[PDB]
Design an enzyme around this catalytic site. Structure first.
Site, PDB file in Angstrom:
ATOM      1  CG  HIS A 256      -7.491 -46.494  41.637  1.00 32.55           C
ATOM      2  ND1 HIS A 256      -7.433 -45.142  41.331  1.00 32.55           N
ATOM      3  CD2 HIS A 256      -7.574 -46.625  42.987  1.00 32.55           C
ATOM      4  CE1 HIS A 256      -7.452 -44.516  42.496  1.00 32.55           C
ATOM      5  NE2 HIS A 256      -7.512 -45.371  43.516  1.00 32.55           N
ATOM      6  CD  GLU A 257      -8.104 -49.623  44.968  1.00 35.82           C
ATOM      7  OE1 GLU A 257      -7.259 -49.395  45.864  1.00 35.82           O
ATOM      8  OE2 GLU A 257      -9.085 -48.878  44.752  1.00 35.82           O
TER       9      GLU A 257
ATOM     10  CG  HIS B 111      -3.735 -46.657  46.042  1.00 36.30           C
ATOM     11  ND1 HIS B 111      -3.302 -45.366  46.302  1.00 36.30           N
ATOM     12  CD2 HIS B 111      -5.045 -46.620  45.739  1.00 36.30           C
ATOM     13  CE1 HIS B 111      -4.361 -44.590  46.119  1.00 36.30           C
ATOM     14  NE2 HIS B 111      -5.419 -45.294  45.776  1.00 36.30           N
TER      15      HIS B 111
ATOM     16  CD  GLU C 273      -7.401 -42.790  46.565  1.00 33.38           C
ATOM     17  OE1 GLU C 273      -7.246 -42.956  45.333  1.00 33.38           O
ATOM     18  OE2 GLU C 273      -7.597 -43.742  47.361  1.00 33.38           O
TER      19      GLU C 273
HETATM   20  O1  LIG Z   1      -9.756 -44.689  45.485  1.00 27.89           O
HETATM   21  C1  LIG Z   1     -10.280 -45.535  46.202  1.00 27.89           C
HETATM   22  C2  LIG Z   1     -11.763 -45.444  46.577  1.00 27.89           C
HETATM   23  C3  LIG Z   1     -12.669 -45.536  45.339  1.00 27.89           C
HETATM   24  C4  LIG Z   1     -12.734 -44.223  44.538  1.00 27.89           C
HETATM   25  N1  LIG Z   1     -14.129 -43.762  44.377  1.00 27.89           N
HETATM   26  C5  LIG Z   1     -14.197 -42.462  43.678  1.00 27.89           C
HETATM   27  C6  LIG Z   1     -14.870 -41.453  44.610  1.00 27.89           C
HETATM   28  C7  LIG Z   1     -16.128 -40.947  44.281  1.00 27.89           C
HETATM   29  C8  LIG Z   1     -16.760 -40.037  45.131  1.00 27.89           C
HETATM   30  C9  LIG Z   1     -16.142 -39.642  46.317  1.00 27.89           C
HETATM   31 CL1  LIG Z   1     -16.934 -38.516  47.364  1.00 27.89          CL
HETATM   32  C10 LIG Z   1     -14.884 -40.153  46.650  1.00 27.89           C
HETATM   33  C11 LIG Z   1     -14.249 -41.063  45.801  1.00 27.89           C
HETATM   34  C12 LIG Z   1     -15.026 -44.831  43.876  1.00 27.89           C
HETATM   35  C13 LIG Z   1     -15.722 -44.527  42.538  1.00 27.89           C
HETATM   36  C14 LIG Z   1     -15.202 -45.052  41.354  1.00 27.89           C
HETATM   37  C15 LIG Z   1     -15.851 -44.814  40.142  1.00 27.89           C
HETATM   38  C16 LIG Z   1     -17.020 -44.052  40.110  1.00 27.89           C
HETATM   39 CL2  LIG Z   1     -17.808 -43.754  38.600  1.00 27.89          CL
HETATM   40  C17 LIG Z   1     -17.554 -43.544  41.295  1.00 27.89           C
HETATM   41  C18 LIG Z   1     -16.914 -43.792  42.511  1.00 27.89           C
HETATM   42  N2  LIG Z   1      -9.614 -46.564  46.710  1.00 27.89           N
HETATM   43  O2  LIG Z   1      -8.291 -46.693  46.409  1.00 27.89           O
HETATM   44 ZN   LIG Z   2      -7.520 -44.971  45.470  1.00 27.39          ZN
END
Ligand SMILES: O=C(CCCN(Cc1ccc(Cl)cc1)Cc1ccc(Cl)cc1)NO
Ligand SMILES: [Zn+2]
Length: 391
Positions: free
Chosen positions: A208-209, A212, A234
């Site tokens: 994922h990272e 980006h 995203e």
């Molecule tokens: O995309 C990201 C941040 C991480 C993404 N998250 C998903 C997310 C969940 C809830 C909200 Cl409000 C916003 C984003 C982390 C994440 C990954 C896997 C899981 Cl199962 C839960 C959270 N960084 O590039």
């Molecule tokens: Zn991301």
């Protein structure tokens, strides 16, 4: 494979791939031990208190969504730093084991940030923020160009992101130039979702990272003030059904905006008469960019539309978290937004726990079927549930 040196944190410095370095934070930092795992890619097994000196405190504030976790001691011992390094290396090899992963890493390595640092529009010059300072035996520093840094997380241990140093005038991640990317990431923890309680494969999180990183290295990232509350960048990175929430017209508008930024870069190349640096031939650097931007008897550069469109779709639609899920053959949450709130301590370093080929879903064992390896209850020894940060 992708990382041919299986580094140990304790390995002595050699100044080529095992060295003490300073990142271009614009502040006075102490040098940290780093590891060049592949060309243009370094790994810093340290808590990220360097990229943003404002966030140098590892103490907790709680963030409602997503789920958060705090330890001020995680990644402070040499042994943790060793396991971190081995954990990240394994995940790089896991990504590389796939055809999609092999493709993305190759695209990342070729994604050298543009030499747009000069005051003179006819002169090429590297931008300092796209380099690291490598210590030499006499204590002086030598400037080294790089595309990617993997760094340990800052305060919120499970907050992972791809970030980079900006420019005073230029929007490097949105002008086609690209800039060196810093990924805050930990292989030592993961998230649980529901579909039945399952854990996210850290290779999916890492892929994922790197998606980006791919966008930002090619200067095609979608402005973070363009949202839905979820950014288009995203939605695009996650892919699948969520990516289709970005309309066809906004997609064409971005595709055309970047064909134009690639046009501008090709012209900057065509007008270049001089170059800064010792080992920096003008024709060598024009070929680097020609290779990166896939540009087309006289030496004049052009943007081929069919090559542009193929490359653009490669970075924005083929390199998606969804396609890596299909390739790794693992279970993952259905949508980007997830409020499950479950954090697990993991150790993916031993072959007995996680492998480059199967992940947690080990073959010829009870874990190979129905994603049992990712089941936090069936494979309960691989996932120690931690307390989510509340206050
Ligand atoms: O995309 C990201 C941040 C991480 C993404 N998250 C998903 C997310 C969940 C809830 C909200 Cl409000 C916003 C984003 C982390 C994440 C990954 C896997 C899981 Cl199962 C839960 C959270 N960084 O590039
Ligand atoms: Zn991301």
């Amino acid at each position: 494979g992708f990382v041919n040196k299986q580094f140990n944190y304790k390995d002595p410095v050699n100044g080529v791939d095992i060295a003490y370095i300073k990142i271009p934070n614009a502040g006075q930092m102490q040098p940290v031990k780093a590891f060049k795992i592949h060309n243009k890619i370094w790994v810093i097994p340290e808590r990220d208190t360097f990229t943003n000196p404002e966030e140098g405190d590892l103490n907790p504030p709680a963030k409602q969504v997503p789920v958060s976790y705090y330890d001020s001691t995680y990644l402070s011992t040499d042994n943790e730093k060793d396991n971190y390094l081995k954990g990240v290396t394994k995940l790089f090899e896991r990504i590389y084991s796939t055809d999609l992963g092999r493709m993305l890493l190759t695209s990342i390595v070729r994604g050298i940030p543009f030499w747009g640092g000069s005051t003179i529009d006819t002169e090429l010059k590297v931008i300092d923020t796209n380099c690291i300072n490598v210590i030499q035996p006499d204590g002086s520093y030598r400037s080294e160009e790089l595309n990617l840094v993997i760094i340990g997380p800052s305060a919120d241990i499970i907050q992972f992101e791809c970030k980079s140093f900006g420019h005073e005038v230029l929007n490097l991640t949105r002008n086609g130039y690209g800039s060196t990317q810093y990924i805050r990431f930990s292989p030592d923890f993961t998230f649980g979702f529901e579909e039945g309680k399952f854990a996210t494969d850290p290779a999916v999180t890492l892929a994922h990272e790197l998606i980006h990183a791919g966008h930002r290295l090619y200067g095609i990232a979608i402005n973070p003030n363009r949202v839905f509350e979820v950014s288009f960048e995203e939605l695009r990175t996650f892919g699948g059904h969520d990516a289709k929430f970005i309309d066809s017209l906004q997609e064409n508008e971005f595709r055309l905006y970047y064909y134009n930024k690639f046009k501008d870069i090709a012209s900057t190349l065509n007008k270049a008469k001089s170059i800064v640096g010792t080992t920096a031939s003008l024709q060598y650097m024009k070929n680097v960019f020609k290779e990166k931007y896939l540009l087309s008897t006289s030496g004049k550069f052009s943007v081929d539309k069919l090559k542009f469109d193929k490359l653009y779709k490669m970075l924005t639609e083929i390199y998606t978290e969804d396609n890596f899920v299909k390739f790794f053959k693992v279970l993952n949450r259905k949508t980007y937004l997830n409020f499950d709130k479950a954090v697990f301590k993991i150790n993916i370093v031993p072959k007995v726990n996680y492998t480059i080929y199967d992940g947690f879903n080990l073959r010829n064992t009870n874990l190979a079927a129905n994603f049992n390896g990712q089941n936090t209850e069936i494979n309960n020894m691989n996932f120690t549930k931690l307390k989510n940060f509340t206050g």
